[PDB]
Amino acid sequence: EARKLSPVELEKLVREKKRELMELRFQASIGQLSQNHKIRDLKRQIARLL
RNA sequence: AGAUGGUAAGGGCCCACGGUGGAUGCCUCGGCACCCGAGCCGAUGAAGGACGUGGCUACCUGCGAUAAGCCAGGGGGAGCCG
Numbered sequence A: 001e002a003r004k005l006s007p008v009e010l011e012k013l014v015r016e017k018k019r020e021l022m023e024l025r026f027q028a029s030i031g032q033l034s035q036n037h038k039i040r041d042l043k044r045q046i047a048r049l050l
Numbered sequence B: 001a002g003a004u005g006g007u008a009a010g011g012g013c014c015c016a017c018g019g020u021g022g023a024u025g026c027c028u029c030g031g032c033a034c035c036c037g038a039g040c041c042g043a044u045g046a047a048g049g050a051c052g053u054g055g056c057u058a059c060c061u062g063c064g065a066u067a068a069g070c071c072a073g074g075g076g077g078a079g080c081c082g
Helices: A006-020
Strands: none
């Protein structure tokens, strides 16, 4: 469960990389954005052990 | 007084060359028939949909706020981000 926290973080990360854009001012478009395409998601696949 | 020619505003026929239009022929991610095979799906929420999803996205196609995708195993063997 220390898991959910890392996400809350990663979540903010993206919900930050977001406006990191908005005004076309962030040249790593894919990189740090399709980021979540795993981080925040993948490893959000927490199997309630049991 | 006598006589048969030229002139074409435009028209007619014929030849050539174009325009338009899409027959014809040749094609074919399609269709039709028949014969085999195969034959249920749903409150573990179906069939069908709405809306939303991409760094830039109108539509189509994918997916579902984990959103053109996530984990695992198997197959593959150089290109991939429809």
